């Protein structure tokens, strides 16, 4: 389960539940980057992202 | 489950549930990048993305 | 479970639950970066991200 | 379990539960960075992130 | 369990539970950085992060 | 267990539980930094982080 | 990569590479079994399986 | 990478590489079993498995 | 990396590399079993497994 | 890295490298078993496993 | 790193490296068993395991 | 690092390196067993294990 909200038989109010997270490059199992690396050049660009709510 | 909202028999109010996340490049199992790499050039560009709500 | 909210048979109020986190590059099992590395150049850029709520 | 809120049969009030954390690069098991490294250059940039709630 | 709140059969009040932490680069088991290192240059930049709630 | 709150059959009041901590780079088992190091340069920058609640 | 064999420019011999494993119910990320469970009965049967080479 | 064999420019001999493991129910991140459990009955049966090489 | 063998420019001999392990139920991060448990019955059966090489 | 063998530019001989281990239920971070437990019955059976090489 | 062998530019001989260990239930950080326990019954059985090499 | 062997530019001989250990239930940080316990019954059985090399 990732960010699953389960509500039952309730009386909700305003702004009641908030789950905010930044999980970039998290939760790796056996996942290698440049494991046997020689003479490499890494200049990859990644622009803005995520959630921008106003 | 990813971002599944389940509500039953309730009285909701304004702005009640929010689940915001940035999960870029997360949750890898056995997934390799440049595992046996020699003399490579990485300059891939990725522009803006995500959710922009105003 | 990651950020799962479970409520049952309650009377909620305003701003009641908040779960905020920054989990970037967390929770690694057996995940190597530059394990056997020689003469490499790492200048990857990553822009802004996460959750920006106003 | 990461940031899972479970409430049952209660009367909630305002701002009742808060769980805030900065878990960047935490919780590693057997995860190596630059284990056998020689003559490497690390200048990777990472911009702002996390949770910004106002 | 990380930051899991479990409440049952209660009468909550305002600002009742708070769990704040800074866990950056914590909880390592067998996780090496620059274990056999010679002539390396580490100038990686990491911007602001964490939880900023106002 | 890290920062897990368990309450049952109670009458809560305001500001009742607080658990604040700074656990940066804590709790290491067999985790080495620069174990066999010669002629290295460490100038990695890490910006502000943690929990900022106002 | 799972069980990928890559050989190049070699002189192989008999029984040269063997990779045997039992990975049943391994490598879970955020995957819950009976998370909020009450009064359940689990008697599922699973017969023999795996690799039987003679 | 899980059980990946990479050989290059070599002269192999008999029975040269062996990687045997029993990884059942290993490598869990945020994966809960019977997290909030009450009055459950678990009698699931699982037969023989794995690798049987003769 | 889990059980990854990397050889390059060598002269191998018989029975040269062996990596044997029993990793059952190892390497857990934030993974709970029977966290808030009351009156449960656990009698799950698991048969033989692993690697049996003759 | 778990049980990763890296050899380069060598002359191997017989039975040269051996890495044997029993890592059952090892390496836990924040992983709870029966944390808040009352009146439970644990009689789960697990058969033989591991590596059996003859 | 767990049981990682790194050799470079050498002349190996017979039975040269051995790393044997029994690490069952080792290396725990914040991992609780029966933390708040009352009236529980623990009779879980675990059969033989580990490495058996002949 | 756990049981990591690093050799470079050498002339090895027979039976050269041995690292044998019994690390069962070692290396605990903040890890409690039966912390607040009342009227419990512990009769869990664990069979043979470890490394058996002949």
Curated annotation (Swiss-Prot), chains A, B, C, D, E, F, G, H, I, J, K, L:
Top-rank taxon: Eukaryota
Protein's name according to its UniProt entry: Amyloid protein A
Organism of origin: Homo sapiens
Stretch list, region Important for amyloid formation: 1-26
């Amino acid at each position: 389960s990732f960010f699953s909200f389960l509500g039952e038989a309730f009386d909700g109010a305003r702004d009641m539940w908030r789950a905010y997270s930044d999980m970039r490059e998290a939760n790796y199992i056996g996942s290698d980057k440049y494991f046997h690396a020689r003479g490499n050049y890494d200049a990859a660009k990644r622009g803005p992202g995520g959630v921008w709510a106003a």
